[PDB]
Design a protein around this ligand. Structure first.
Ligand SMILES: OC[C@H]1O[C@H](O[C@H]2[C@H](O)[C@@H](O)[C@@H](O)O[C@@H]2CO)[C@H](O)[C@@H](O)[C@@H]1O
Ligand SMILES: [Ca+2]
Ligand SMILES: [Ca+2]
Ligand SMILES: [Ca+2]
Length: 472
């Protein structure tokens, strides 16, 4: 990274052009150039380049990633005076605190809502259970009831959590990273409902963000599920849409994960002063947040003034109604593992490649004990040796990645076994989606032969190991 300027990363669905306007104001006033970029997979690339001392000066993402970044020494501690803290809501500062330190600036509060075409559907269904029958009606006139992104677990999690799914159990003031709530009866019920919607052809397992967005904004489907950033494009489509409560499932509300868009400062930036100035006195103002929101709505911004100004907007009100019914995302480093786990499970259940029960059990194991890192042509799998929480440590020789042709390098620590594998050699399965090439294999723990009687929790366990790379 180079000093005298600022490089900013932010996701491509956010208002990066408005942010660039803020940067242009900054530049004119101070002479310091600001370059805003939106690389794909930036939440995964940032730790890779920041660990070598490179990467952007500022990284934007929902707060849930930042704990990992902070645990890895990648984030500078931020030091706002008391007055600036008084300018933002306490909930948001809470979201960006890790081990008693502030590790990023809160920007805005995000939550999914149900977005619906008022002309096609004047009265949105209050329950998921209605949607199959409703779909029938709409299918009779060449339309669908619901389409939304099924490739990212962020969008399916509300249904999964409604009847009792959860990420990590919060207990005694801390999250128990071995107590994952993706494999309980409620999560299984929610995912079964989703997979049923697919099997009965009310939804297609391949639908992604762009497909669902195009369908809804063209008037081909009566509903979608999305956050404030999407509203802009809908406005341009001139569809007459409303933003409202997500449907219930078995009488309980959908529970979306509440995100807080946050901006962290790279620990290796030589421009930490400039970054603080830009964030506090340029972006986190009525003018800055106004520009960014005008591009792609931010939601309920953390700055009290502009949030009070925008609360009249009923869409913000529905976003916050849904947020209240949901849970704030943890920011612990294990969230990435959680997300990988659920992602894989959902896809594999939606395709029918795996049952719901098996997919969610494997996701429990993956979130609790496995970390997948996908590199150019190589894969790294890190397995917790305390695989079942018993405190009994697995031996490396009982762990196998892939089939016999897969011959990884295996390294052992006190607490983990790490597999460094060649993707071509270890891919059991390859396939293409619209947007990605997918390489897939499995991790197996099989201690047999073992002399003792196997009882209760089984010692044989198999989890999906998968990497997705953009098609270009
Ligand atoms: O799907 C897993 C993904 O969910 C969240 O990402 C959201 C993000 O919060 C929103 O700002 C918007 O970009 O949609 C994203 C999902 O595509 C988590 O914050 C992220 O860590 C997680 O991977
Ligand atoms: Ca569990
Ligand atoms: Ca696409
Ligand atoms: Ca706009």
């Amino acid at each position: 990274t180079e000093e005298g300027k600022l490089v900013i990363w932010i996701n491509g669905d956010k208002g990066y052009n408005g942010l660039a306007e803020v940067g242009k104001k900054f530049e004119k006033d101070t002479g310091i150039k600001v370059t805003v970029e939106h690389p794909d997979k930036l939440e995964e690339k940032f730790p890779q380049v920041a660990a070598t001392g490179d990467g952007p000066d500022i990284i934007f993402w929902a707060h849930d990633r930042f704990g990992g970044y902070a645990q890895s020494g990648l984030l500078a501690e931020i030091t706002p005076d008391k007055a600036f803290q008084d300018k933002l809501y306490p909930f948001t500062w809470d979201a960006v605190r890790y081990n008693g330190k502030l590790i990023a600036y809160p920007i805005a509060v995000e939550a999914l809502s149900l977005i619906y075409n008022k002309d096609l559907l004047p009265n949105p269904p209050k329950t998921w259970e209605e949607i199959p029958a409703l779909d029938k009606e709409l299918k009779a006139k060449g339309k669908s009831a619901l389409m939304f992104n099924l490739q990212e677990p962020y969008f399916t999690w509300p249904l999964i959590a409604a009847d009792g799914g959860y990420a990590f159990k919060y207990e005694n003031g801390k999250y128990d990273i071995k107590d994952v709530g993706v494999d309980n009866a409620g999560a299984k019920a929610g995912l079964t409902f989703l997979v049923d919607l697919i099997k009965n052809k009310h939804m297609n397992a391949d639908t992604d963000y762009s497909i669902a967005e195009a369908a809804f904004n063209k008037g081909e489907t009566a509903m979608t599920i999305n956050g404030p950033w999407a509203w802009s494009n809908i406005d341009t489509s001139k569809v007459n849409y409303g933003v409202t409560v997500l449907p219930t499932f078995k009488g309980q509300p959908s529970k979306p994960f509440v995100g807080v868009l946050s901006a962290g400062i790279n620990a290796a930036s030589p421009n930490k002063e400039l970054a603080k100035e830009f964030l506090e006195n340029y972006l986190l103002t009525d003018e800055g947040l106004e520009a960014v929101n005008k591009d792609k709505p931010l939601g309920a911004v953390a700055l009290k003034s502009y949030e009070e100004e925008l609360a009249k907007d009923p869409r913000i009100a529905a976003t916050m109604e849904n947020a209240q019914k949901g849970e704030i995302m943890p920011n612990i480093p294990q969230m990435s593992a959680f997300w990988y786990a659920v992602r894989t499970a959902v896809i594999n259940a939606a395709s029918g490649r795996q049952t719901v029960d098996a997919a969610l059990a494997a996701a429990q194991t993956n979130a609790a004990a496995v970390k997948v890192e996908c590199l150019e042509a190589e894969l790294v799998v890190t397995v917790s040796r305390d695989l079942f929480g018993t405190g009994k440590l697995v031996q490396p020789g009982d762990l196998t990645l892939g089939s016999e042709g897969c011959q990884p390098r295996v390294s052992v620590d006190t607490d983990v076994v790490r597999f460094n594998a060649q993707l071509h050699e270890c891919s059991s399965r390859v396939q293409m989606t619209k947007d990605a090439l997918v390489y897939s294999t499995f991790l197996l723990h099989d201690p047999r032969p073992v002399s003792g009687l196997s009882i209760l929790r089984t010692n044989r366990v198999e989890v999906p190991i998968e990497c997705r790379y953009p098609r270009l």
